Amino acid sequence: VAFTVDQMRSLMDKVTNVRNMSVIAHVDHGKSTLTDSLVQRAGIISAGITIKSTAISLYSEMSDEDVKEIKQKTDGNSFLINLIDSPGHVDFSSEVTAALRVTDGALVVVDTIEGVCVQTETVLRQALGERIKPVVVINKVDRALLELQVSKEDLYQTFARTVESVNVIVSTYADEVLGDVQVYPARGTVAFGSGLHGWAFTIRQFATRYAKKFGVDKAKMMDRLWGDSFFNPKTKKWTNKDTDAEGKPLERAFNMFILDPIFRLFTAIMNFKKDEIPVLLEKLEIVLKGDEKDLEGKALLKVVMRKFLPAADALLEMIVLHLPSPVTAQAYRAEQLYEGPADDANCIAIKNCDPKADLMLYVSKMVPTSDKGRFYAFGRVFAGTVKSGQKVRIQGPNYVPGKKDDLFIKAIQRVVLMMGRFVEPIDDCPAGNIIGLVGIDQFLLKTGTLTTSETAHNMKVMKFSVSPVVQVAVEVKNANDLPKLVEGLKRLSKSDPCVLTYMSESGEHIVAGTGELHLEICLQDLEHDHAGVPLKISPPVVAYRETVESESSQTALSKSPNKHNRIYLKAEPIDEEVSLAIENGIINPRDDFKARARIMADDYGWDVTDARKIWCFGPDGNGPNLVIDQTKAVQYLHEIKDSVVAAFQWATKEGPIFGEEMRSVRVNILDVTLHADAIHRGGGQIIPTMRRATYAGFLLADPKIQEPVFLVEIQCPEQAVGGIYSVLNKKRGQVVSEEQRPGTPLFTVKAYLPVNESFGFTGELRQATGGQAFPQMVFDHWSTLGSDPLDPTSKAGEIVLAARKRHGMKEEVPGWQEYYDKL
Amino acid sequence: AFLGDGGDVSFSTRGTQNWTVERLLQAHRQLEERGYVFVGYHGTFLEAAQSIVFGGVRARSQDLDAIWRGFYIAGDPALAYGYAQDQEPDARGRIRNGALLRVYVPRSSLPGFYRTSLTLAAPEAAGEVERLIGHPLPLRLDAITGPHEEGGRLETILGWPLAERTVVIPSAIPTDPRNVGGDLDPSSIPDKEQAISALPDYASQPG
């Protein structure tokens, strides 16, 4: 259905008629299939710039008496349904939480035969922890009839057990502050059907049918169409007794009025009984058209079932009538989604879904767009209204009311509707609606909170890190395909802000990710989409850091190739506080050298003299490494500054130990002798000198290496929590805390896990917990190994040697004498 | 073709591709079998190496006095090693390691090789060199060997005409990508290459 920007706005205005929801389903249960039925039925089209589909807008219209059945405030017959996209596998835990956090309802898909799988169970558990209301649809009914050929009673009992299992999970993990949220078929919160053939139904749909043929309000008929209600065919009497006077079995209403009609069509059509089909179709008033009247077998069965019980209708019915609106849900989800006071002015504005109060927009993810390499911020307005041109307070993850850390007061260029793959610019957007923002990707990596009050805390933040902890070497198998890989890498780095593609000094094409899986999917996306050529990929390698933890044993000295220039320097460790401050923007390269110096002096115990003589950061001109000019009366010193800085960029990018980046390394240039003539002290002369002196100074400051460490947060039922510790105890894991959810048997275990010990972690944790555990790990900190990296037998040395060999370097680490002036 | 048997030879930061000590021993032998002799090393940057080995040594304008123009090589690879690297960085400040080249000439040119104790490329030596080669500078179909600086190592200058009759192949002595600017470690010189690196006996007296 095509709509104009105006019609959309007038629909987003009535928040009471909006449905923010997602779909919880296993990919093998026809998740995308049922989703297609919805978009092909109620999909909203608009009457240039493309984006990765993150959300879909649906439109459903109902009756005055249909809307009457809604136990929440409503306004009109029109309804806007936001279908938020969900990941395909549970392993993508971080983005599973992201989608659920911006939703209020959930369409949970469950298999007829297999019932509720472990994955869907775990996800529903999380959705309930987010205070999300569920509506169930039992899919793949077709398989039960066509393959298993079960009886009506057998099919019913199967649905019964299924519904039971779902409510066992619901009643256990659903928050007590929501009341009975269990699903009941008789109440229309459960649908049945087959996405494959595109048919589905609810008890309400059939109650509406027989409401007249029995002169009964569908409320009572609905109650009879499930459970122990029996309509005796011989006496035409309703009964609660499953046997007549003579003790003969009576068929339940569900089997008699719902299943039977379907079963008869399945039987007549699949048995090619050309004489029965017509009569059976007119009986149910199912009219065929031209070509359709000649179909047979599955072909015909799919057409008949499709127009008999359109799948999308049954789903939309539950979504509109039972799923909460932004208004309803935010009243009990506000406290939970606000990392601050419950009686706050903003938290209250979120409870009331107040479009007038201070803006409280939540950014769940950044979306790749066709507008260059820019990303549009996807999220939801929980309070106030976002506007084009409006200036907003961009509050990052590390932001806190008081400090100005991780804050960016900028202006929203354009606020747009995310119509799946396309974008539609609008003026504003009241609270309760999902929306996209243009011109923020340069302030928010992925998650963030936008406000308008100078006293507003961040909304429940989703921890994330861009730090490339794992990487691989990418290489084409066919030399001719090189150009295709070069552009494929530049493309891959644009479809994901957390992916890193760069070239090592040796020229290797490097692809680095945030985790084993994340990197895995990237390499598959590359070899099939971004590139499409047969690739040779090396095994996953962990990224380390080269550092020092003492001052150089002695002054480092190095000459230039022409022997006319000398650089004297000394290396020394930088405090972790300072390295963290640098990485967190506190101490900034682009900052005024005097403002920065004051900070380093007052807050970090630096000599303001040194702090004012910072020549550069590194690597990439902003890393946690510094060059300090401590020279005295060196003529023409400034004429080599650009060279010294450049050399430092390369020296810090790949260190002397085994080619890994430096961290927390401070270089003090103590003295410099230069040739009077500039001709003999250009980049070609200075660069190698500085770079070698640095290496020499580094090696003299007792070298060490640091390893990346994850912070793992795991949700798990008490029963299987024991498996969490079982796995961690052989992964050098360090338990941080074990907390239990009030009321439920759900535990949250947080622990540190070395990245180089996390390979295959989710798979092992899976088995150790029977799939009950819900992993979620983000980079936390670097950790200096105690062992000597120069000792090939030690842990650190063992790591170095293997790396050295792999890179084809000399096995033994070079002594400082190599880089020191040879004399 | 004087590169021996194997794959396509190319120059890289990672080292000279398809060039082993064994292949060198084959290329060297086959050179001598055709009346060629080894006269020293030439260090330079990768692109220059590619040009010199596949296109040949060609005359070019260089930054010195006209009379001393020619192709510069060193008997001791360590001296030539110092020039086997980029002289200018790119836009990002990258200074790549280069490659050591072996320089061969036709034995028929040997009578033109002379040696001196004087420091070359200096006006005080121009007279003695012009005496030795039997004509005024620049060098032509002849060569001169002597200290590249007082108390320094020996360098050889091939007259451009003579330089263009050379045959140049890669050395089995690698440059260090992780130590650009460092000195040549003798231990990194393959023992089997040192064995074929004896220099000819140069004349100390004019013809």
Ligand SMILES: NC(=O)c1ccc[n+]([C@@H]2O[C@H](COP(=O)([O-])OP(=O)(O)OC[C@H]3O[C@@H](n4cnc5c(N)ncnc54)[C@H](O)[C@@H]3O)[C@@H](O)[C@H]2O)c1
């Ligand atoms: N290069 C050496 O190995 C070497 C050996 C002994 C002494 N030296 C000293 O170094 C100084 C610099 O001499 P240089 O030769 O390095 O610089 P140069 O100015 O003499 O030559 C310029 C550059 O052009 C390059 N080139 C590219 N293609 C070429 C081709 N087809 N034919 C010839 N050359 C080509 C050479 O490699 C050389 O580096 C000399 O003054 C000499 O005293 C150098």
